[PDB]
């Protein structure tokens, strides 16, 4: 997240951090106690038998007792198209089931095919790069953004921060877009670099998947 602010610890306890030996590479959502939802592209070409799913994280550079670490048992994809960046969703079934508590809770999804109107105020959030030089976040960042249908396709949900250059960056993929309490996007892709100020960012439209996610978490 470029130009966002430090979230309040565990102010979003459905927020997951997918990690490899060295560190965070993408974000995810706790959609069930034993399932997480992220961006397909994040695990397409990773050794998923190495990936760690860290729940209850806040300051990744720190040591937090708060945290619960799983491993992915299985992946469910729904026809990612890497060359058009279509259906950039996955689900990751964990080798366990977490302990729901204050710092780890399950997100609500919207209803099947709820379409987001232009103008809708949402919150984008991630541990991705803080900007064209500043590295990846230690502390979870959150960003106020708006739904924009211009410069977008209908098979994404697109956000834009008007009048500043701010938005999602590398490693924010997989991360939720929470609109009105409900998880409307997953962080897929940027145009022009991050924080272009011109092109909206693009999120996999969760409400277009919901019935699929449902038949998989029940």
């Amino acid at each position: 997240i470029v130009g966002g602010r430090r979230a309040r610890p565990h102010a979003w306890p459905f927020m997951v951090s997918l990690q490899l030996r060295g560190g965070h590479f993408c974000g995810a959502t706790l959609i069930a106690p034993n399932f997480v939802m992220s961006a397909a592209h994040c695990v397409a070409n990773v050794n998923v038998r190495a990936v760690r799913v860290v729940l209850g994280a806040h300051n990744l550079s720190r040591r937090e007792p708060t945290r619960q670490v799983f491993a992915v048992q299985r992946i469910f994809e729904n026809g990612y198209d890497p060359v058009n960046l279509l259906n950039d969703i996955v689900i990751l079934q964990l080798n366990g089931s977490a302990t729901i508590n204050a710092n780890v809770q399950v997100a609500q999804l919207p209803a099947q095919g709820r379409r987001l109107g232009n103008g809708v105020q949402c919150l984008a959030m991630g541990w991705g790069l803080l900007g064209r030089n500043r590295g990846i976040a230690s502390v979870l960042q959150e960003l106020n953004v708006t739904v924009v249908t211009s410069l977008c396709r209908r098979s994404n949900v697109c956000t834009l921060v008007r009048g500043r250059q701010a938005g999602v960056c590398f490693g924010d993929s997989g991360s939720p877009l929470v609109c009105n309490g409900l998880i409307h996007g997953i962080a897929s892709f940027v145009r022009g670099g991050c924080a272009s100020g011109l092109y909206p960012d693009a999120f996999a439209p969760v409400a277009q998947f919901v019935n699929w996610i449902d038949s998989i978490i029940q």
Partner: peptide
């Protein structure tokens, strides 16, 4: 540009 993030 489209870079996947």
């Amino acid at each position: 540009x489209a870079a996947p993030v």
